[PDB]
Coordinates of C-alpha atoms (C1' of nucleotides) and ligand atoms in Angstrom, one line a residue:
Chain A
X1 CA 89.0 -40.4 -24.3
X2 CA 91.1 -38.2 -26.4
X3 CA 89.6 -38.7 -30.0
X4 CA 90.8 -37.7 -33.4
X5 CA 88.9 -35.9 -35.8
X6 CA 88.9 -34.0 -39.2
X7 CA 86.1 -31.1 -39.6
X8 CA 84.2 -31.1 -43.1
X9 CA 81.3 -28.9 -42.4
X10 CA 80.3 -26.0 -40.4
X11 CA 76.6 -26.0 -39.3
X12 CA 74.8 -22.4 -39.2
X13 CA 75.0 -22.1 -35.2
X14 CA 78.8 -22.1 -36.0
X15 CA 80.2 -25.2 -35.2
X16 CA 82.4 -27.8 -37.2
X17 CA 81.0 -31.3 -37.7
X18 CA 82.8 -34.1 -37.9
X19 CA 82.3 -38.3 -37.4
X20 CA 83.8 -40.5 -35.4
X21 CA 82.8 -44.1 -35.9
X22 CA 79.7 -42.5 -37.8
X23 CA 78.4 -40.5 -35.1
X24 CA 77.7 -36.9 -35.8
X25 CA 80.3 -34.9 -33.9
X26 CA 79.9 -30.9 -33.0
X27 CA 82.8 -29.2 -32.3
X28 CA 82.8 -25.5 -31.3
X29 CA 86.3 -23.6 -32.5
X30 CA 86.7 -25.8 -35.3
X31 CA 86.4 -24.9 -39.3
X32 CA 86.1 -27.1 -42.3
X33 CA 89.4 -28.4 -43.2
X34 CA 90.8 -28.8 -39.5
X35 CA 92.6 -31.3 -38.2
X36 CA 92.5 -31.9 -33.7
X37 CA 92.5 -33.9 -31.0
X38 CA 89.0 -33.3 -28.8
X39 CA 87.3 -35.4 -26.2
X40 CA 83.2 -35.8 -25.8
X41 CA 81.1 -33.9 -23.3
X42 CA 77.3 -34.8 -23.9
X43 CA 77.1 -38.3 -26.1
X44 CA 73.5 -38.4 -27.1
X45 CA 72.4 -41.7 -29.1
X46 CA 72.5 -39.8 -32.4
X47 CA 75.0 -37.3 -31.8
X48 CA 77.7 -36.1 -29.9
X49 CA 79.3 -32.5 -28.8
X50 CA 83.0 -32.0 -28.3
X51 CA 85.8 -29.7 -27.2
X52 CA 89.3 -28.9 -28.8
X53 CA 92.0 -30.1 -26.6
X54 CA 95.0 -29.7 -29.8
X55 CA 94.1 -28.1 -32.9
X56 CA 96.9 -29.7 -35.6
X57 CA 95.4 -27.6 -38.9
X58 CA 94.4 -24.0 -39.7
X59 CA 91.9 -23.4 -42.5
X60 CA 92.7 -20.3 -44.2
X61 CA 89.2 -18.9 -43.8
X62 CA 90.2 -19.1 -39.4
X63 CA 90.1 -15.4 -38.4
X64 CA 91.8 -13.7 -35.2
X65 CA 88.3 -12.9 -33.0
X66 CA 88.4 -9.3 -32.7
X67 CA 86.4 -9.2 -29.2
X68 CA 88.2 -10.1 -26.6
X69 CA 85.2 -11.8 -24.9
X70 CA 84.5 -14.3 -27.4
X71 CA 84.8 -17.6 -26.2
X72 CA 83.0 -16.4 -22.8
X73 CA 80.0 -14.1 -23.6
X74 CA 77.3 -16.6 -25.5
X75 CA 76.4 -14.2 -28.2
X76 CA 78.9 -14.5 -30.8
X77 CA 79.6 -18.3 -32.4
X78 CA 82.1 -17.7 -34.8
X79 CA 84.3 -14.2 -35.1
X80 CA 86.9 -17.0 -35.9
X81 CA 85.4 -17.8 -39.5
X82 CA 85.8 -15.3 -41.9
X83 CA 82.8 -13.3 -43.3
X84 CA 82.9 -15.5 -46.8
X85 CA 83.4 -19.1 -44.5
X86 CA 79.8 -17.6 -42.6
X87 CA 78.2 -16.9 -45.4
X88 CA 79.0 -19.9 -47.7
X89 CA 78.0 -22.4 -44.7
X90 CA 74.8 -20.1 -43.5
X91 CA 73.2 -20.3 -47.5
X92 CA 74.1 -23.8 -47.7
X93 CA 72.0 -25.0 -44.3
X94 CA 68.9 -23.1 -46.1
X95 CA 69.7 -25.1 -49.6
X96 CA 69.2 -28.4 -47.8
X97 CA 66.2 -26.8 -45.9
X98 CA 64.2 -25.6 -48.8
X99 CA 65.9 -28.1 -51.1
X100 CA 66.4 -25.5 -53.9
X101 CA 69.6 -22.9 -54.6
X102 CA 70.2 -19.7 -52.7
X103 CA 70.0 -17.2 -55.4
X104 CA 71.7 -14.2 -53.6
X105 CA 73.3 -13.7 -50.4
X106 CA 71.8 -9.7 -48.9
X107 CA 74.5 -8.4 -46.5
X108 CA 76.0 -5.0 -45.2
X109 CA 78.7 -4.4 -42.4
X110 CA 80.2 -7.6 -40.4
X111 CA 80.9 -5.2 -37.6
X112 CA 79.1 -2.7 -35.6
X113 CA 75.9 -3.9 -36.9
X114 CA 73.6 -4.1 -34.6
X115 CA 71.5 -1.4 -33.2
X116 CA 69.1 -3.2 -30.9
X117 CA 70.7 -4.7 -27.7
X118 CA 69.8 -5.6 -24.2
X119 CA 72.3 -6.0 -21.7
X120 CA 71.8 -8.2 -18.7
X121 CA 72.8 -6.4 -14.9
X122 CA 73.5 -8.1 -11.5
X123 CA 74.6 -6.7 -8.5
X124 CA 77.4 -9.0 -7.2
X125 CA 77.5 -8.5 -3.1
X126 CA 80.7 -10.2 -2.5
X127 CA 82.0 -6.8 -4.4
X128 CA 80.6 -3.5 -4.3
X129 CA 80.5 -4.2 -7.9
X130 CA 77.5 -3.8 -10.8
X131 CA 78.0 -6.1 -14.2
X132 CA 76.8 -5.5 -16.9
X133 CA 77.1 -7.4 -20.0
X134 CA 75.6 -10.4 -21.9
X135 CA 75.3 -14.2 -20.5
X136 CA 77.6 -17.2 -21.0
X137 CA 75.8 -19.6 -23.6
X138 CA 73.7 -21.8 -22.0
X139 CA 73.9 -20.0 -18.3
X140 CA 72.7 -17.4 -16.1
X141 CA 76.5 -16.1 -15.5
X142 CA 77.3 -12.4 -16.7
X143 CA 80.2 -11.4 -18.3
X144 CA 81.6 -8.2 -18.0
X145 CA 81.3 -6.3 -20.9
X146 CA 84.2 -3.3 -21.9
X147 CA 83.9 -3.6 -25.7
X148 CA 81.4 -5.5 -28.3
X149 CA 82.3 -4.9 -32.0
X150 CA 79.0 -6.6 -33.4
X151 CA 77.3 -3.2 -31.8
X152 CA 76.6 0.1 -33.1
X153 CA 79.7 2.3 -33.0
X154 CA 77.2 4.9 -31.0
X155 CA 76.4 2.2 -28.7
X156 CA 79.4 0.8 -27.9
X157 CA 81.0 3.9 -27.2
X158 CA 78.3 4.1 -24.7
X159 CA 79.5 1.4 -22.6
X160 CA 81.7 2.5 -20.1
X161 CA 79.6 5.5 -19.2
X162 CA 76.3 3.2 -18.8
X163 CA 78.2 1.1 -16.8
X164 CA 79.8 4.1 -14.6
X165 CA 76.6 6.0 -14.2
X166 CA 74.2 3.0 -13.5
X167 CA 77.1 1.8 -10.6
X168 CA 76.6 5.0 -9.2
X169 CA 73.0 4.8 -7.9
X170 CA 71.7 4.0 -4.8
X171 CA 69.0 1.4 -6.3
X172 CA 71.8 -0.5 -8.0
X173 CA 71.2 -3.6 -6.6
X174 CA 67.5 -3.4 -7.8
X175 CA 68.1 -3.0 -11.9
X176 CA 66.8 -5.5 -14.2
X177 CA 68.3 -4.6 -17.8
X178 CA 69.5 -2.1 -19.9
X179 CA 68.1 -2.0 -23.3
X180 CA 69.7 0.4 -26.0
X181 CA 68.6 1.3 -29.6
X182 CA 70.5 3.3 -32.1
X183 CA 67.7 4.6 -34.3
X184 CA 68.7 7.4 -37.4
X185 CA 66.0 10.2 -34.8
X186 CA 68.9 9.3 -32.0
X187 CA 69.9 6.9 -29.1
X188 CA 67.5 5.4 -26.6
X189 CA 68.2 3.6 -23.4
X190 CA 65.5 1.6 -21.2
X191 CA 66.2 1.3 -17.7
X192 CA 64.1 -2.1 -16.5
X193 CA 64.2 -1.6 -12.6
X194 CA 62.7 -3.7 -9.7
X195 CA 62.4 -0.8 -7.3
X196 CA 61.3 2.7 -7.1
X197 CA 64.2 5.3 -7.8
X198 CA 65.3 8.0 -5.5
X199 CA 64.6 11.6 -7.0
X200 CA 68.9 11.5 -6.5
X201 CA 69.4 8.9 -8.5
X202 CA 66.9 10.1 -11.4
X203 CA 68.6 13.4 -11.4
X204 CA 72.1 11.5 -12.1
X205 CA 70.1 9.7 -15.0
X206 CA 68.8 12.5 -16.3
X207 CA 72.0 14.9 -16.4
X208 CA 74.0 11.7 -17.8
X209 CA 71.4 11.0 -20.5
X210 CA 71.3 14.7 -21.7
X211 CA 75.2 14.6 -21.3
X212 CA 74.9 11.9 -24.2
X213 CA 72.1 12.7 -26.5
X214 CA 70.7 10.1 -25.2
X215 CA 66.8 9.6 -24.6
X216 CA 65.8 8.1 -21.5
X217 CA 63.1 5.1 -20.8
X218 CA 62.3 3.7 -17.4
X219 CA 60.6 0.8 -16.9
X220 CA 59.6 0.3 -13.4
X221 CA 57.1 -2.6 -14.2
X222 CA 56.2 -4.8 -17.1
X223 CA 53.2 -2.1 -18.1
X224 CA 54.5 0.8 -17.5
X225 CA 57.3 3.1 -19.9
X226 CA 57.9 6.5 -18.2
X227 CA 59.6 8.6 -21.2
X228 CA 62.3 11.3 -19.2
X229 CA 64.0 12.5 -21.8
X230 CA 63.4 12.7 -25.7
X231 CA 61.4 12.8 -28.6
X232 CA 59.4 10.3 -30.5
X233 CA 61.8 8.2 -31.8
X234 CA 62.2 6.9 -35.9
X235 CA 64.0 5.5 -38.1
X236 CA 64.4 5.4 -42.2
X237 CA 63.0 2.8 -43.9
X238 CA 63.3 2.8 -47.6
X239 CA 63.8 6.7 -47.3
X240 CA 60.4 7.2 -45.4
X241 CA 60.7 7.8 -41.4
X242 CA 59.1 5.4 -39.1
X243 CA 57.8 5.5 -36.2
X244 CA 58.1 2.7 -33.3
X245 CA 57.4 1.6 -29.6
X246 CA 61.2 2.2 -28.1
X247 CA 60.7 -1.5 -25.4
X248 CA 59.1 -3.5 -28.8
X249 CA 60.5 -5.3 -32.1
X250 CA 62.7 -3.1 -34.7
X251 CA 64.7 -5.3 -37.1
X252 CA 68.1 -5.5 -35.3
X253 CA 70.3 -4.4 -38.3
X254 CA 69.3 -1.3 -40.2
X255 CA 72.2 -1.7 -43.3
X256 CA 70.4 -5.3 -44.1
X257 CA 66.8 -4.0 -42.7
X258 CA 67.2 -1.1 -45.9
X259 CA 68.4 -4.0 -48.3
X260 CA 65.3 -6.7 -47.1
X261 CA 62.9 -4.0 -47.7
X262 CA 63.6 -3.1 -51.3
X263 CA 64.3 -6.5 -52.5
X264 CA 60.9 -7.6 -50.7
X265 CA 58.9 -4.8 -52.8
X266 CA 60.9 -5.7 -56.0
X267 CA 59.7 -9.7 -55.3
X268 CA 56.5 -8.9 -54.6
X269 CA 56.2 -6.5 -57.9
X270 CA 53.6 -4.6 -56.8
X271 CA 51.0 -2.9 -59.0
X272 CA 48.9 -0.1 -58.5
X273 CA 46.4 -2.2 -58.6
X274 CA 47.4 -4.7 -56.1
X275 CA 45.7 -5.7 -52.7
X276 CA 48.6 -6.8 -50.3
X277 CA 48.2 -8.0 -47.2
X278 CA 51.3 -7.9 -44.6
X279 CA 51.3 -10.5 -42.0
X280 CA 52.9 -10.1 -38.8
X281 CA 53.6 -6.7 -40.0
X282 CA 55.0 -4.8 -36.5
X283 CA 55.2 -1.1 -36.4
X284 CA 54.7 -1.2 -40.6
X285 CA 58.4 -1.9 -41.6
X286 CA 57.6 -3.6 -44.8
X287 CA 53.7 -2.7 -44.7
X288 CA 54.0 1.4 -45.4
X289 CA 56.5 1.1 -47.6
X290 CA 53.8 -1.3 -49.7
X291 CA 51.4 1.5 -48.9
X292 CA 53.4 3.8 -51.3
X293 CA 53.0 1.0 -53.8
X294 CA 49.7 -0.6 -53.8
X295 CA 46.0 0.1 -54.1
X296 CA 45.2 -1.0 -50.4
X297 CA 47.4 -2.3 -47.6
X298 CA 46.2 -4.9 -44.7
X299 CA 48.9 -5.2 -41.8
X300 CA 48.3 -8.2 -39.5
X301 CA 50.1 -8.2 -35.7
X302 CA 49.2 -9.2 -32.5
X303 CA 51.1 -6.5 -30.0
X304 CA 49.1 -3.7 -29.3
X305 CA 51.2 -0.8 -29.2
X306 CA 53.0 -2.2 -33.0
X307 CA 49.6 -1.8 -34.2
X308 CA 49.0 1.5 -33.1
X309 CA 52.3 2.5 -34.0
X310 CA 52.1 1.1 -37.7
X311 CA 48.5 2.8 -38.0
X312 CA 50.6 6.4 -36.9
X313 CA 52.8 6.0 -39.2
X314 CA 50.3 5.8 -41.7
X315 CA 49.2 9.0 -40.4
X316 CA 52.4 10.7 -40.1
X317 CA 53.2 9.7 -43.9
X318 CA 49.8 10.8 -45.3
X319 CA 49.0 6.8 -46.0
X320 CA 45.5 6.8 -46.5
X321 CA 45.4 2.8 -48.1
X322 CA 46.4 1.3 -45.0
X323 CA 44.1 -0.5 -42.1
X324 CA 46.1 -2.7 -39.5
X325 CA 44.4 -5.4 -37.5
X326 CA 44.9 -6.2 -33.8
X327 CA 45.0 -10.4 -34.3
X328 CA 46.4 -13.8 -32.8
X329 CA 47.8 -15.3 -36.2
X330 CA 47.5 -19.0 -34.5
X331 CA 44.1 -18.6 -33.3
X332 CA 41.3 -19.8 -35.8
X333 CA 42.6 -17.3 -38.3
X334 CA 39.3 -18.1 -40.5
X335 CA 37.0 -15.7 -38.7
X336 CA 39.3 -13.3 -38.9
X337 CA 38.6 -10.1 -40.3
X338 CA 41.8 -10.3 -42.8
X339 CA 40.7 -13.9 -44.0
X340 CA 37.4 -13.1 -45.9
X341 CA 38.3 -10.8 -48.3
X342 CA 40.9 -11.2 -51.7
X343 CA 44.3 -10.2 -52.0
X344 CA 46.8 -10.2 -55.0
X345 CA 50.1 -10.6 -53.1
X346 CA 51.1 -11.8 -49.6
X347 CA 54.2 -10.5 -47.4
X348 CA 54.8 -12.4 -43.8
X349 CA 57.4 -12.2 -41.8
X350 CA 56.9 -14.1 -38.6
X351 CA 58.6 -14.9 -35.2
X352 CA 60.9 -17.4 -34.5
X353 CA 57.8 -19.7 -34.2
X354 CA 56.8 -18.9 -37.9
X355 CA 53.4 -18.8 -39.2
X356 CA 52.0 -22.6 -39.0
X357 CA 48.7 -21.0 -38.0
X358 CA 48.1 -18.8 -41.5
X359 CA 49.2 -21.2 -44.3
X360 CA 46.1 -22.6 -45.2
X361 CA 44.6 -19.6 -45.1
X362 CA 47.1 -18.0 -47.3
X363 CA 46.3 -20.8 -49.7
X364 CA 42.4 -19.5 -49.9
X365 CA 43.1 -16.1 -50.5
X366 CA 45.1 -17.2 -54.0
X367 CA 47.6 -14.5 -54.2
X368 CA 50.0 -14.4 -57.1
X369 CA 53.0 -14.0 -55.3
X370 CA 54.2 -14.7 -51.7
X371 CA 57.2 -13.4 -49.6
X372 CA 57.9 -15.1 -46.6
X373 CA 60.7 -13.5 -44.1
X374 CA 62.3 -15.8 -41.8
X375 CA 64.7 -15.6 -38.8
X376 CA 64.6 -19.5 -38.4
X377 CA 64.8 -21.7 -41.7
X378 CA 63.4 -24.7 -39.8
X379 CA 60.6 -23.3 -39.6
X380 CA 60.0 -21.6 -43.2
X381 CA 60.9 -24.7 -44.5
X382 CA 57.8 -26.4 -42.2
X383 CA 55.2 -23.9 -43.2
X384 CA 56.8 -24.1 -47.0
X385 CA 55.8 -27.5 -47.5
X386 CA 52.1 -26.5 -47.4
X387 CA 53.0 -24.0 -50.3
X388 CA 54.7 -26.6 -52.4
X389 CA 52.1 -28.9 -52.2
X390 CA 48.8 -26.4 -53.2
X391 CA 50.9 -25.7 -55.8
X392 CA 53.1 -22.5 -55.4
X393 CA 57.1 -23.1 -56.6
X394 CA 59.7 -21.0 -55.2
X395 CA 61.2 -18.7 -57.4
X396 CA 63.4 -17.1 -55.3
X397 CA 65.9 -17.6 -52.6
X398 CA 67.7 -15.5 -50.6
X399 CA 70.1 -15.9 -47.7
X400 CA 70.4 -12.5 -45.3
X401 CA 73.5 -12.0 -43.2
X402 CA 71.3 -10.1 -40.6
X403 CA 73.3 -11.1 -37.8
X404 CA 77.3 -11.5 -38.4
X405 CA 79.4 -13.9 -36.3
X406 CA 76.2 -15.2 -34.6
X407 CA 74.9 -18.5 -35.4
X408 CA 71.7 -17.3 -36.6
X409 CA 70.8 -16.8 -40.7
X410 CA 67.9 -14.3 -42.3
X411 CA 66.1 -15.4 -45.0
X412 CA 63.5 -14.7 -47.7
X413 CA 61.7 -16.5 -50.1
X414 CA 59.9 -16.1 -53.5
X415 CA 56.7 -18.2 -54.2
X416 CA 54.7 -17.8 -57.5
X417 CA 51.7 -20.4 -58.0
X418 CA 51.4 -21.7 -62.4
Chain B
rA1 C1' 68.2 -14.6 -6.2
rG2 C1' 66.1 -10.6 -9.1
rC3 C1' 65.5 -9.1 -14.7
rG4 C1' 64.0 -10.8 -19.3
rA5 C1' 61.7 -15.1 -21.8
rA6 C1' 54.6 -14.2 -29.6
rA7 C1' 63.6 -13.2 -27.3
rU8 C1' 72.9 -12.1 -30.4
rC9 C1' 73.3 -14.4 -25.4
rC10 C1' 69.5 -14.7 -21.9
rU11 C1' 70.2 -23.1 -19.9
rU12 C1' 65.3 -27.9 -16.6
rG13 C1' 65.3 -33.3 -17.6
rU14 C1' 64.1 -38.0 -20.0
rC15 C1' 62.0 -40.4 -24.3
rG16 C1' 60.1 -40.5 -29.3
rG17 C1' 59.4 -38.6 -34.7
rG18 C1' 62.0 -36.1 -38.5
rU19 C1' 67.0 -35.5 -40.1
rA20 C1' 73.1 -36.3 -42.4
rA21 C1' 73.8 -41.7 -36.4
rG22 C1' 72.8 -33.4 -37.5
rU23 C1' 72.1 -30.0 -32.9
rU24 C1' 67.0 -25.8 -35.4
rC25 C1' 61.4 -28.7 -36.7
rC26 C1' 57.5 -31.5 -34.4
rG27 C1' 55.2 -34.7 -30.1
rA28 C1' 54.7 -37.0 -25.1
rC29 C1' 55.8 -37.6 -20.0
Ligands
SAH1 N1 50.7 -15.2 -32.7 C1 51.0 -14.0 -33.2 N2 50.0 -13.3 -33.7 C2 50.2 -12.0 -34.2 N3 51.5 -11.5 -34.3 C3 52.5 -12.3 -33.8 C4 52.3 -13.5 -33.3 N4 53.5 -14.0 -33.0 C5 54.5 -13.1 -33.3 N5 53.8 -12.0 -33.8 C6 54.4 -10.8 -34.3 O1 55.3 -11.1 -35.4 C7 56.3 -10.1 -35.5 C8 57.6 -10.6 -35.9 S1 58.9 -9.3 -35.9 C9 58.8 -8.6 -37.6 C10 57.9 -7.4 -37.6 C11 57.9 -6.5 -38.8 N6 57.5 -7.3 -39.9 C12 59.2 -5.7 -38.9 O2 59.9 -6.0 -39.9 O3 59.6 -4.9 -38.0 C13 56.3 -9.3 -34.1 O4 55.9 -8.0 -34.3 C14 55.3 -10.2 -33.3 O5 54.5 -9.5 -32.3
SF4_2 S1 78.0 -10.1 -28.3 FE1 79.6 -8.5 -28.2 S2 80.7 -8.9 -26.2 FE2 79.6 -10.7 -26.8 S3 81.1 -11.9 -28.1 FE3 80.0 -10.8 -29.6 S4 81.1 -8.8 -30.0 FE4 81.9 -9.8 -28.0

RNA sequence: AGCGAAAUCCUUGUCGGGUAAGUUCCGAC
């Protein structure tokens, strides 16, 4: 029941792998070149997951985890492998994908790196007690969160007051979320609540918000933002400012988000002459700065207020090269406005879901070059194969460390057609 | 419960394809 076990691999979502009697064997808190004892707790017909009862070996890539609710709070895998251990196992998972060699590996700060978080809130009644924090892997529980070195420095100082402040209200049992965003304008915070707030508890909001620099966001519904406090908010993107919608999608670290963006352009080589079109392009993160490169500019997205926000940034920045189109990239993408005219290069950088929808359509417009952006290499891999096979080669590969000690892995990829 | 869910975490199940007896991809109930 006790089983043995040595540990030659660590997958990208952070665990070791192992075999026992040939099975596949996931082990969380185990690193390549470990020796323990485990025992098995699911046992599926091609695979089984374990956990470490005796760990006999240390690898000397183990690290001490510097939060003290890793382990607990599901959103770090692996703050006990060491930056160059992550890195090493996170570019070779997207060899084996795209069966071709990671050709550079784009990272910035392993801590405090993330600007873009949403912490979960439940009243407990047993207690007089708010939490707030993140949710155990795989469950609904919260933990309690007093520190979280992945964040921001800004943000996590922020902690204990958001959490003191937001136990102090009357309509404490009624919050949702809390979502916070360090942008380079300032510090936002969206309040996600379930029922109305007293003028008494607004007031305390508002006094602790401008007690913090903070801007203020409510969100009493799943339609409505009331702004309270602060100005439009922006952040710098390749040295141009950038507008965006405070509740929707801003790359989550802005050290690697700065690095993506000028490797991209240099990729893409873009002439002065060039047509590009940007494919699920957001509030314009890669599209504007393409703007200050190319002859014209499409930006594809299908969120409304991204859109609008990438065609005021345009504005803002004097862009006059640059349409964006409201459009469902997996509806029939054909009679789509983007899809009948030419372009010369291609940028996408889709969701989780990638872009199964747009290949073939990609195909037809012939482009010279292609950069695809992916936050899931099964996927990029699944929508490469199309590529590959109408005759585009992949001429560079990148692995981006986007999100430290998680078990999730950035990527980009160069395709030129002969 | 409630919140969120074209998402760092934010969990239905079973079965199948793919895969490294490999979790991500894909499909059915
Ligand atoms: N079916 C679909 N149609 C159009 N846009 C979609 C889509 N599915 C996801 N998206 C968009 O794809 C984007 C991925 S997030 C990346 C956005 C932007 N490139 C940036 O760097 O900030 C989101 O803005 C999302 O709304
Ligand atoms: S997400 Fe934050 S609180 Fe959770 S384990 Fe990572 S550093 Fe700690």
């Amino acid at each position: 029941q006790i089983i043995t076990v040595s540990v030659n691999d660590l997958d990208s979502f952070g665990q070791g792998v192992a075999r026992h009697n040939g099975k596949t064997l996931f082990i969380p808190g185990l690193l390549p070149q470990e020796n323990a004892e485990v025992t098995v707790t699911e046992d599926k017909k091609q695979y089984a997951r374990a956990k470490v009862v005796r760990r006999l070996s240390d690898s000397p890539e183990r690290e001490t985890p510097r939060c003290p609710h890793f382990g607990v709070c599901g959103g770090c895998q692996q703050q006990h492998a060491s930056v160059d251990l992550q890195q090493r196992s996170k570019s070779a998972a997207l060899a084996r994908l795209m069966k071709h060699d990671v050709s550079e590996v784009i990272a910035d700060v392993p801590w405090g790196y993330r600007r873009r978080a949403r912490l979960s809130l439940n009243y407990l009644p047993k207690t007089q007690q708010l939490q707030m924090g993140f949710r155990k892997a795989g469950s609904s529980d919260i933990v309690d969160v007093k520190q979280c070195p992945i964040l921001a420095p800004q943000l996590e100082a922020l902690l204990p007051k958001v959490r003191a402040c937001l136990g102090s209200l009357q309509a404490m049992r009624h919050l949702g979320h809390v979502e916070l965003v360090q942008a380079t304008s300032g510090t936002l915070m969206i309040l996600r609540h379930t029922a109305p707030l007293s003028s008494a508890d607004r007031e305390k909001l508002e006094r602790f918000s401008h007690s913090e620099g903070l801007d203020l966001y409510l969100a009493p519904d799943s339609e409505i933002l009331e702004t309270v406090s602060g100005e439009m908010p922006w952040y710098d993107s390749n040295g141009l400012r950038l507008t965006f919608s405070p509740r929707d999608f801003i790359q989550v670290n802005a050290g690697v988000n700065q690095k993506m963006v000028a490797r991209a352009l240099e990729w893409l080589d873009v002439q002065p002459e060039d047509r590009v079109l940007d494919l699920f392009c957001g509030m314009g993160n890669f599209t504007l700065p393409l703007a200050t490169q190319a002859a014209s500019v499409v930006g594809v997205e299908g969120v409304p207020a991204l859109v609008e926000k990438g065609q005021q940034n345009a504005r803002l920045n004097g862009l006059q090269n640059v349409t964006f189109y409201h459009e469902n990239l997996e509806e029939d993408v054909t009679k789509q406005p983007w899809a009948k005219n030419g372009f010369d290069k291609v940028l996408l950088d889709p969701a989780r879901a990638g872009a199964a929808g747009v290949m073939q359509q990609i195909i037809k417009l012939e482009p010279i070059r292609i950069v695809y952006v992916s936050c899931n290499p099964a996927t990029l891999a699944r929508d490469s194969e199309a590529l590959l096979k109408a005759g585009y080669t992949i001429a560079r590969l990148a692995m981006l460390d986007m999100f430290p000690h998680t078990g999730h892995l950035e990527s980009m990829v160069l395709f030129s057609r002969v």
